[PDB]
Design an enzyme around this catalytic site. Structure first.
Site, PDB file in Angstrom:
ATOM      1  CG  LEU A 136      -2.117  -0.966   1.151  1.00  0.00           C
ATOM      2  CD1 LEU A 136      -2.757  -1.127   2.513  1.00  0.00           C
ATOM      3  CD2 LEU A 136      -3.167  -0.493   0.136  1.00  0.00           C
ATOM      4  CB  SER A 160       7.196   1.971   2.247  1.00  0.00           C
ATOM      5  OG  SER A 160       7.874   2.526   1.131  1.00  0.00           O
ATOM      6  CG  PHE A 204       4.206   4.835   7.468  1.00  0.00           C
ATOM      7  CD1 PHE A 204       4.298   6.033   6.761  1.00  0.00           C
ATOM      8  CD2 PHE A 204       3.869   3.676   6.772  1.00  0.00           C
ATOM      9  CE1 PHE A 204       4.044   6.084   5.398  1.00  0.00           C
ATOM     10  CE2 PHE A 204       3.611   3.719   5.421  1.00  0.00           C
ATOM     11  CZ  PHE A 204       3.696   4.927   4.726  1.00  0.00           C
ATOM     12  N   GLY A 205       7.282   2.691   8.142  1.00  0.00           N
ATOM     13  CA  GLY A 205       7.598   1.315   7.753  1.00  0.00           C
ATOM     14  C   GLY A 205       7.029   0.989   6.386  1.00  0.00           C
ATOM     15  CB  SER A 206       7.019  -1.745   4.219  1.00  0.00           C
ATOM     16  OG  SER A 206       8.240  -1.111   3.873  1.00  0.00           O
ATOM     17  CB  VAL A 207       1.413  -0.233   5.255  1.00  0.00           C
ATOM     18  CG1 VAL A 207       0.036  -0.762   5.559  1.00  0.00           C
ATOM     19  CG2 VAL A 207       1.987   0.524   6.449  1.00  0.00           C
ATOM     20  CG  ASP A 212       2.307  13.178  12.342  1.00  0.00           C
ATOM     21  OD1 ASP A 212       2.681  12.203  11.627  1.00  0.00           O
ATOM     22  OD2 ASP A 212       2.420  14.375  11.980  1.00  0.00           O
TER      23      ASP A 212
HETATM   24  C1  LIG Z   1       0.714   9.307   3.348  1.00  0.00           C
HETATM   25  N1  LIG Z   1       0.379   7.959   3.793  1.00  0.00           N
HETATM   26  C2  LIG Z   1      -0.170   7.022   2.822  1.00  0.00           C
HETATM   27  C3  LIG Z   1       0.646   7.609   5.191  1.00  0.00           C
HETATM   28  C4  LIG Z   1      -0.150   6.375   5.606  1.00  0.00           C
HETATM   29  C5  LIG Z   1       0.102   6.080   7.069  1.00  0.00           C
HETATM   30  N2  LIG Z   1      -0.532   4.835   7.493  1.00  0.00           N
HETATM   31  C6  LIG Z   1      -1.661   4.298   6.959  1.00  0.00           C
HETATM   32  C7  LIG Z   1      -1.855   3.131   7.648  1.00  0.00           C
HETATM   33  C8  LIG Z   1      -3.035   2.235   7.425  1.00  0.00           C
HETATM   34  C9  LIG Z   1      -3.795   1.925   6.198  1.00  0.00           C
HETATM   35  C10 LIG Z   1      -3.592   2.391   4.785  1.00  0.00           C
HETATM   36  C11 LIG Z   1      -4.664   2.623   3.943  1.00  0.00           C
HETATM   37  N3  LIG Z   1      -4.125   3.053   2.769  1.00  0.00           N
HETATM   38  C12 LIG Z   1      -2.771   3.097   2.869  1.00  0.00           C
HETATM   39  C13 LIG Z   1      -1.778   3.450   1.966  1.00  0.00           C
HETATM   40  C14 LIG Z   1      -0.437   3.396   2.341  1.00  0.00           C
HETATM   41  C15 LIG Z   1      -0.086   2.976   3.617  1.00  0.00           C
HETATM   42  C16 LIG Z   1      -1.072   2.607   4.523  1.00  0.00           C
HETATM   43  C17 LIG Z   1      -2.401   2.671   4.144  1.00  0.00           C
HETATM   44  C18 LIG Z   1      -4.897   1.059   6.695  1.00  0.00           C
HETATM   45  O1  LIG Z   1      -5.807   0.558   5.943  1.00  0.00           O
HETATM   46  N4  LIG Z   1      -4.861   0.820   8.038  1.00  0.00           N
HETATM   47  C19 LIG Z   1      -3.792   1.531   8.499  1.00  0.00           C
HETATM   48  O2  LIG Z   1      -3.450   1.546   9.742  1.00  0.00           O
HETATM   49  C20 LIG Z   1      -0.904   2.983   8.621  1.00  0.00           C
HETATM   50  C21 LIG Z   1      -0.662   1.994   9.560  1.00  0.00           C
HETATM   51  C22 LIG Z   1       0.449   2.129  10.392  1.00  0.00           C
HETATM   52  C23 LIG Z   1       1.294   3.225  10.259  1.00  0.00           C
HETATM   53  C24 LIG Z   1       1.039   4.200   9.315  1.00  0.00           C
HETATM   54  C25 LIG Z   1      -0.066   4.071   8.475  1.00  0.00           C
HETATM   55 CL   LIG Z   2      11.133  -0.208   8.191  1.00  0.00          CL
END
Ligand SMILES: CN(C)CCCn1cc(C2=C(c3c[nH]c4ccccc34)C(=O)NC2=O)c2ccccc21
Ligand SMILES: [Cl-]
Ligand SMILES: [Cl-]
Length: 273
Positions: free
Chosen positions: A12, A14, A17-20, A135
């Site tokens: 989704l 990165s 906040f890591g890689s999601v 934040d």
């Molecule tokens: C600018 N962006 C995309 C920052 C996204 C930050 N972010 C979204 C998410 C999450 C979701 C995201 C939903 N769409 C996303 C696209 C890029 C990354 C994350 C998500 C989700 O469905 N549930 C989430 O917690 C998230 C989880 C842990 C740490 C950071 C997170």
């Molecule tokens: Cl990481």
């Protein structure tokens, strides 16, 4: 095990906040978000009641994930040799508020009111659970497009809520208050209200009010879009230079602009469907 319990999908995104990754829970096809972070990249550590060493993000998420709320809930977490993996709720269909405003422009005040109200209720939930997000911003708010519900994400900059001064800050600068800029000092609730003022301005004007430090500490709020007098007043109050001059959450929610809020479902029907 992690891999037997969740089917992993595409990345989704990165960043800090890591890689999601998109995922689904195998047991009932629940949509989830699967977040990975390398241990070496974790700055803030905490401990669970039972004394396990975990990222502070896990501590904070556990504290806010009980019962229903406008926060994305932590469903499970796993420790790997070199990383942590967090399983989080994933609304579907979803768009973050930054993308929503970028695409649609400044929001009609009825829609901004509904959205802002929901964010206020979510931040109250966090504070009641003893958590400061630190934040709050458009990028950290997900919209459940079918339900009209907003959900707070990314507790990676958060802290336990306290009444004493904070001297550390790794959130987003342009949402950071003038006392941080000037003194490297802030208190939790009043700094949160500042960020909420920035957010509200962003909703109704389509962009943030300040770019440079000198504007932040000047705190002159110029409006680029037509915004009602009541909304301008609330924004200017949230963005008071002196932290003690800012409204409490109660004062925000009792403000004339905040009256007659739409429910999430009617918000969706009128503005999102
Ligand atoms: C600018 N962006 C995309 C920052 C996204 C930050 N972010 C979204 C998410 C999450 C979701 C995201 C939903 N769409 C996303 C696209 C890029 C990354 C994350 C998500 C989700 O469905 N549930 C989430 O917690 C998230 C989880 C842990 C740490 C950071 C997170
Ligand atoms: Cl990481
Ligand atoms: Cl309420």
């Amino acid at each position: 095990p992690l891999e037997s319990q969740y089917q992993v999908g595409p990345l989704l995104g990165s960043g800090g906040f890591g890689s999601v990754y998109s995922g689904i829970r195998v047991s009932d096809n629940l949509p989830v978000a699967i977040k990975h972070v390398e241990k070496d990249r974790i700055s803030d550590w905490g401990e669970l009641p039972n004394g396990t060493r975990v990222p502070m993000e896990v501590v904070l998420l556990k504290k806010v994930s009980s019962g229903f709320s406008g926060v994305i809930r932590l469903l499970d977490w796993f420790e790997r040799p070199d990383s942590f993996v967090l399983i989080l709720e994933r609304p579907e269909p979803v768009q973050d508020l930054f993308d929503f405003i970028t695409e649609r422009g400044a929001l009609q005040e009825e829609l901004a009111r509904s959205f802002f109200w929901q964010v206020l209720e979510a931040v109250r939930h966090c504070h009641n659970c003893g958590v400061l997000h630190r934040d709050i911003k458009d990028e950290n708010i997900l919209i459940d497009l079918n339900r009209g519900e907003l959900k707070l994400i990314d507790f990676g900059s958060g802290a336990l809520l306290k009444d004493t001064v904070y001297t550390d800050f790794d959130g987003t600068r342009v949402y950071s208050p003038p006392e941080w800029i000037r003194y490297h000092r802030y208190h939790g609730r009043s700094a949160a209200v500042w960020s909420l003022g920035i957010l509200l301005y962003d909703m109704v004007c389509g962009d943030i009010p300040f770019e440079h430090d000198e504007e932040i500490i000047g705190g002159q709020v110029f409006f680029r879009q037509r915004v009602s007098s009541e909304c301008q007043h609330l924004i200017r109050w949230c963005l008071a230079l002196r932290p003690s001059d800012r409204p409490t959450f109660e004062e925000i929610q009792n403000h004339p602009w905040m009256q007659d809020v739409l429910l999430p479902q009617e918000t969706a029907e009128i503005h999102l469907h």
